């Protein structure tokens, strides 16, 4: 009753606590021994930065039963604004000890206003200044300090180890770990504080710098204390937003902190940290299903993006079911990257908007409930740093503002992003209840968050560790496991991060944790770590844990390559993952720890691997696993040389294949694959398995787990994208096997005779293996293949129906509503001249039908699975949606049949047979079939901007070009420094994003989309918004795109206002006519804007929607006028056979030919003679501008000026351009025509186009040496740098051709001096072999600034 | 006359 202490005890220990504070004077275990807490009369209590020390009266005790007390504490401060009474919890339970406040009371308060309103007097931070919960003494035996600290750095180690001596001298010193050993006992702290502070190092904020210990030294007698305390907790946080706006937000949880007490845990002779860190994961927070992260062999993206619909989600769980069939059923962890809106970085921050396109809601739950089955995990990429006006998220409150009231702009590519104001999104209750939108449509189906680039400091100057641990708190709270983008960021709850798991990004300072103490505590628990990746060094140098390598095969930064994805799972990842299925008990000899980076009391053995690095780890039913490094030394073979072992035996050993790809390597594994693939259990007995690998190829012996012994065989499978393979019988003896296995191919090892992993191709697809993915076998069991000709599935890759001659490829559709509109569409790619046609017959007769020629426009879409970088065959891909539409029968009797029709030897490719609901009706037939009208107002697309295809302006691109959405006010003209409408009708357009100055095609419509007639006339009409005359161009060609074979009609700015375009096309004899939007040479009109306000005022952007095609009435023709058109067009141009090119006139005979075939046809009608003679029409009308062009090259290069303007009035095109793309501007320079170079570039020339060898103009302006005309091409924007073919800048070819004052001036306008040429040759190295002296010293002057 | 027939000389 007198006795100012009391004794709380367990079966483990007896723990003496003060009754005048929550202290504890010492632990002592059953055998003994002691370990100290706060030996001192310290009862200091911080409450928002001001410390207040505690008497008597100020604290009341109460023992609530032997293993629990209760404190009451009076903290008041009346000069600081502080009347606080804090009650405070301390339990303990085995060998651990918990100190919880478990309840905060203000009497300067009445709480937190409705709307987190600022509390006057909240109480912010509270914390235990030296509390000493555990200490160790400089008088103590092996006394000691181990820490660590954040760092994504590959070559600097976050850990600190050092022993505690009379010399150890630190103030709240802070840790994200940290552990103290001596006598025999060694603790941890744990605490769930959210305090930012010191780290080693990291890119981001966002939960990177999170530490939680402060360790602090006093004296106690005469020797030295180092003691542990909890570093400060938020309680009521006032924060402020982005207008100045405050708030007071609750605890993200009440302050809580623990102790657990161990001695020699892993009964290795010594006490350390190791043996307080495998007491330490008894009381440590775990981060949300991380029990499941061992089970996620498959990490990958399947990526959607600018309304393509390159991933739609019943295709996803296709590829889920190919990559179970390849790994024997492994679990597998699909992020979604575009899963919502229109694609990637579309409609942020929208959670709830399930993309349309893809399927909706509806399909995403049945990926992710069918994929369940098959292991598979499903997770979707979100963003709550910014927005686009599109979402309907995106308000004036959710805006970040900059100190000046302007927005905080983000980054331009499809729309303009802008920032979000994080404290408000937070504090306002928006974010989460955009999660919850999210909820109602996943339920529990969904496993995972993915949150992108949060740390980055783009929605506040915070993101710090509270505001993390609250995002964490929104997302985990409804069933999701969180994982993030950064390295380092968010340390107490992330399980995944994708610069720590992709080791390709960021280079060797920006990686995952690199710290021995986080390794070894939560290896198993996350893919946040540091892999292989050699080029790194240090962590990243052969890590005996392995660590994640991600790599994808569904677009994801262009990723397709199948064969690349599934060879790196087993070389890393496999390893890696069954490494996390066990816990790290000794790590000892890390050769990353040295007395020079502060690590001197690091853990060592030279008993154990030689001196080398070793790690132990055990589960929870006694299994031992040992990883050993060969060598310590970087310079040895051996330093990249692992052994494992499992209960005694080993099961891998060898070098890995080098991580980076820059060296194949030779490690061989057999590896006991015990468990399976959704909690993680057991398998039983008789369905244990083994996976074997073998990087060079060959054959090994391996002596089979215990279990195994006995057998006398075992069953040996090659896997494939088929499943199990090439079954094997081999024999066993003395409990050992011999494998002969291919280089790098998987082989399953069972104890007899194995099931084949059972898949349906394509569930709610309508049609069974949609994507060909069944092997040749679909073609029997799931296609009907008839006709001569050949069907059959082709391409190592992404497997394609591939077509060969007359041939027909049928299947039954399933689960059709009857009466309800259907599209179906199929990719495309036809190197035949025959057809190749999609059909959907009922009962024999047919509902809908379309056809297309030869492809004529290759395939641009980064993220979609046959683009033109992945060989469809000769080293290109055609791949284009082909649609037909129809209502489903009320028989429910409908069939798909892909065809080719010609019986020529050529190939046709499909692929993706997809039958979607749609509501498209804008297409009207005539009686023959052909096409009668097409309006589209984008408002009903399947996906893509059909009828339009994405061109090749920016390559094989995630391209700027997809279909905007309508948001009043914010997607219109007028909001902000918006100047024109994302949509002209309706809630959809087509919009081009800043693709200005490209000098090439951006979009086309294509045949198998629209077809136009030979010799058919349509008229062509549409709505659009352009940002400034002459940036875009209508485009009218044959055939597939060529430079100069095109008509183009320039169209002027409709900014803010819609114009209306309307042409006239008459159909090719080829019927491969098309019309597109084109980028011309012509600079954009910014209208005086600088910085973002030049890329969302919409001066370089093209909106087009309610197009209409309509075939027209033209003059009718008789048989004579016809044949009367042909002499008057042979007797303008038959004579100019020397005047032309080869292909002009091969071109202009076919045309002629044909023209012919219709008139003098047997049993020809008024509509034949007509379509001739408006192809010849059209022929005189292309004829004529031809010469013009070529009457223009020639008055520029023999310098008729006169010449030069009458012809650019008739018709000439000022860009016109040879076989080899020499424009007359190229020309006009190279002759010395001055005159017609300004009056060339006043009209529109393009002062930087290319010629093949990409020689500009002021290229071709230093043969000669035509000092006037450098000056006036420099004046009107050329390239000073620019390179052509041989690596020469216009400064190389000047001093390669002895021109001195060219020189001079190409000098003065800032041609880089450094600039290399394709050899080792700078601009003073091409004066040495021409005899340019006084070039080369002047050059060297500038050089030398 | 681009790069090709001009180097030749
Ligand atoms: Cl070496
Ligand atoms: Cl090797
Ligand atoms: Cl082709
Ligand atoms: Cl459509
Ligand atoms: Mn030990
Ligand atoms: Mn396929
Ligand atoms: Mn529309
Ligand atoms: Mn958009």
């Avoid at chain 1, 398995?689 to 215990?706: E, R």
């Avoid at chain 1, 040749?776 to 077509?803: C, F, I, P, Q, Y």
């Avoid at chain 1, 408006?1174 to 310098?1199: F, H, Q, S, T």
Wanted: charged share 20%; proline share 2%; with cysteine.
């Amino acid at each position: 009753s007198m006795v100012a202490c009391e004794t709380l005890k367990t079966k483990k220990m007896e723990v003496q606590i003060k009754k005048n504070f929550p202290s504890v004077l010492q632990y002592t275990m059953t055998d003994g021994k002691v370990m100290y807490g706060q030996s001192k009369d310290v009862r200091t209590v911080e409450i928002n930065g001001t410390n207040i020390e505690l008497g008597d009266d100020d604290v009341t005790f109460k023992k609530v039963s032997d293993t629990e007390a209760t404190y009451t504490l009076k903290v008041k401060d009346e000069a600081k604004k502080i009347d606080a009474v804090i009650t405070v919890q301390i339990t303990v339970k085995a060998n651990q000890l918990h100190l919880n406040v478990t309840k905060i009371k203000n009497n300067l308060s009445e709480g937190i206003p409705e709307g987190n309103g600022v509390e006057e007097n909240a109480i912010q931070t509270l914390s235990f200044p030296n509390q000493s919960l555990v200490s160790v003494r400089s008088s103590q035996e092996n006394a000691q300090f181990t820490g660590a600290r954040m760092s994504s750095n590959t070559q600097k180690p976050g850990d600190t180890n050092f022993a505690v001596t009379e010399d150890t001298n630190v103030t709240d010193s802070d840790y994200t770990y940290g552990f103290i050993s001596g006598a025999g006992l060694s603790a941890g702290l744990w605490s769930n504080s959210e305090h930012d502070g010191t780290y080693v190092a990291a890119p981001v904020r966002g939960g990177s710098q999170n530490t939680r210990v402060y360790a602090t030294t006093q004296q106690t007698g005469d020797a030295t204390s180092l003691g542990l305390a909890s570093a400060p907790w938020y309680y009521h946080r006032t924060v402020t937003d982005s207008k100045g706006k405050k708030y007071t937000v609750a605890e993200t949880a009440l302050p809580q902190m623990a102790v657990a007490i161990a001695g020699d845990e892993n009964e290795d002779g010594a006490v350390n940290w190791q043996d307080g860190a495998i007491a330490y994961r008894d009381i440590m927070n775990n981060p949300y299903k991380s029990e499941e992260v061992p089970e996620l062999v498959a990490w990958r993206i399947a990526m959607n993006f600018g309304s393509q619909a390159q991933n739609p989600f019943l295709t996803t769980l296709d590829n889920v079911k190919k990559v179970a069939l390849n790994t024997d059923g492994l679990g597998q962890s699909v992020l979604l990257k575009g899963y919502g809106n229109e694609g990637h970085d579309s409609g942020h921050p929208d959670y709830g908007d399930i993309g349309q396109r893809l399927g909706g809601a509806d399909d995403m739950n049945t990926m992710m409930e069918e994929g369940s089955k098959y292991g598979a995990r499903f997770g979707v990429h979100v963003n709550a740093s910014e927005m686009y006006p599109e979402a309907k998220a995106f308000s004036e409150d959710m805006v970040r503002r900059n100190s000046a009231g302007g927005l905080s702009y983000g980054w331009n590519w499809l729309d303009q992003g802008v920032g979000i104001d994080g404290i408000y999104d937070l504090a306002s209750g928006s974010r989460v209840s955009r999660f919850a939108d999210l909820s109602k449509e996943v339920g529990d189906n969904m496993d995972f968050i993915y949150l992108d680039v949060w740390g980055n400091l783009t929605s506040s100057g915070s993101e710090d560790s509270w505001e993390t641990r609250k995002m964490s708190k929104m997302i985990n709270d409804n069933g999701w496991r969180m994982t993030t983008e950064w390295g380092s960021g968010n340390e107490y709850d992330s399980t995944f991060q994708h610069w720590a798991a992709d080791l390709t990004y960021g280079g060797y300072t920006s990686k995952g944790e690199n710290s021995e103490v986080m390794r070894f505590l939560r290896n198993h628990q996350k893919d946040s770590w540091v892999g292989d990746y050699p080029q790194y060094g240090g962590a990243a140098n052969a890590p005996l844990l392995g660590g994640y390598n991600m790599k994808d095969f569904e677009g994801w930064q262009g990723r397709n390559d199948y064969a690349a994805y599934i060879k790196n799972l087993y070389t890393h990842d496999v390893s890696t993952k069954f490494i996390q299925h066990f816990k790290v008990t000794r790590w000892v000899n890390n050769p990353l720890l040295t007395a020079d980076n502060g690590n001197a009391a690091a853990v060592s053995d030279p008993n154990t691997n030689n001196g080398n690095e070793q790690i132990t780890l055990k589960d929870s039913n006694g299994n031992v696993v040992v990883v050993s490094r060969g060598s310590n030394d970087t310079s040895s073979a051996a330093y990249r040389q692992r052994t494992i072992t499992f209960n005694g035996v080993k099961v891998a050993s060898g070098v890995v294949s080098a991580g980076d790809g820059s060296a194949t390597g030779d490690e061989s594994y057999l590896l006991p694959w015990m468990w399976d693939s959704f909690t993680g259990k057991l398998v039983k007995d008789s369905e244990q398995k083994l996976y074997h690998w073998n990087t060079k190829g060959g054959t090994t012996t391996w002596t089979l787990p215990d279990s195994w012994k006995n057998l006398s065989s075992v069953k040996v499978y090659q896997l494939t994208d088929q499943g199990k393979t090439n079954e094997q019988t081999v024999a066993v003896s003395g409990g050992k096997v011999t494998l002969t296995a291919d280089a790098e191919t998987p082989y399953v090892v069972y104890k007899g005779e194995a099931k084949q992993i059972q898949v349906n191709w394509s569930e709610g697809m309508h049609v069974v293996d949609a994507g060909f993915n069944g092997g040749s076998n679909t073609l029997t069991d799931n296609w009907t293949v008839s006709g001569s000709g050949k069907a059959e599935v082709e391409g190592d890759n992404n497997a394609m129906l591939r077509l060969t001659g007359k041939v027909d490829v049928s299947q039954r559709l399933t689960d059709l509503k009857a009466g309800q509109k259907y599209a179906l569409y199929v990719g495309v790619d036809n190197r035949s001249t025959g057809d190749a046609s999609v059909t959907v017959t009922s009962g024999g007769k047919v509902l809908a039908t379309n056809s297309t020629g030869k492809s004529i426009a290759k395939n641009y879409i980064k993220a979609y699975g046959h683009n033109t970088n992945s060989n469809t065959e000769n080293g290109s891909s055609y791949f284009q949606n082909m649609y037909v539409f129809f209502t489903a029968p009320e028989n429910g009797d409908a069939t798909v049949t892909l065809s080719h029709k010609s019986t020529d030897g050529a190939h046709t490719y499909f692929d993706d047979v997809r039958i979607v609901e749609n509501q498209y009706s804008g297409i009207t037939y005539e009686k023959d079939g052909t096409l009668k009208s097409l309006t589209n107002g984008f408002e009903n697309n399947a996906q893509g901007i059909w009828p339009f295809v994405v061109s090749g302006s920016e390559g094989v691109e995630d391209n700027r070009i997809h279909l905007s959405e309508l948001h009043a006010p914010f997607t219109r003209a007028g909001w902000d420094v918006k100047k024109m409408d994302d949509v002209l009708d309706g809630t959809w357009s087509v919009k081009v994003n800043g693709l200005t100055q490209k000098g090439t095609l951006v979009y086309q419509t294509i045949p198998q989309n629209v077809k136009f007639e030979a010799g058919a006339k349509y008229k062509v009409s549409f709505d659009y918004q352009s940002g400034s005359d002459d940036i875009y161009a209508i485009a009218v060609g044959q055939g597939e795109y060529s430079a100069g074979s095109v008509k183009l009609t320039n169209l002027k700015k409709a900014l803010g206002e819609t114009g209306k375009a309307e042409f006239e096309l008459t159909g090719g004899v080829n019927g491969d006519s098309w019309f597109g939007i084109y980028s011309t040479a012509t600079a954009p009109d910014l209208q005086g804007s600088t910085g973002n306000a030049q890329d969302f005022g919409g001066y370089k952007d093209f909106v087009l929607d309610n197009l209409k095609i309509e075939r027209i009435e033209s003059q009718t023709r008789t048989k004579a006028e016809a044949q009367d058109k042909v002499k008057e067009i042979r007797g303008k141009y038959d004579s100019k056979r020397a005047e032309l090119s080869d292909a002009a006139w091969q071109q202009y005979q076919d045309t002629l030919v044909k023209a012919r075939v219709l008139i003098n046809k047997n049993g020809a009608t008024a509509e034949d003679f007509t379509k001739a003679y408006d192809i010849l029409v059209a022929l005189d009308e292309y004829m004529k501008l031809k010469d013009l062009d070529r009457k223009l090259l020639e008055a520029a290069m023999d310098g008729q000026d006169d010449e030069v303007r009458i012809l650019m009035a008739n018709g000439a095109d000022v860009n016109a351009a040879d076989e080899f793309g020499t424009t007359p501007l190229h020309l006009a320079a190279f002759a010395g025509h001055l005159e017609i170079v300004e009056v060339l570039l006043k009209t529109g020339a393009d002062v930087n186009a290319d010629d093949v060898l990409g020689d500009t103009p002021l290229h071709l302006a230093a043969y000669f040496g035509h000092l006037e005309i450098v000056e006036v091409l420099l004046k009107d924007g050329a390239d000073v740098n620019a390179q052509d073919h041989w690596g020469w800048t216009p400064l190389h070819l000047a001093a390669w051709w002895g021109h001195l004052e060219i020189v001079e001036v190409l000098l003065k306008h800032g041609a880089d001096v450094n600039a290399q040429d394709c050899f080792g040759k700078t601009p003073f190295d091409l004066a040495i072999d021409n005899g340019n002296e006084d070039i080369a010293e002047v050059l060297q002057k500038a050089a030398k600034l | 006359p681009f790069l090709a027939l001009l180097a030749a000389x």
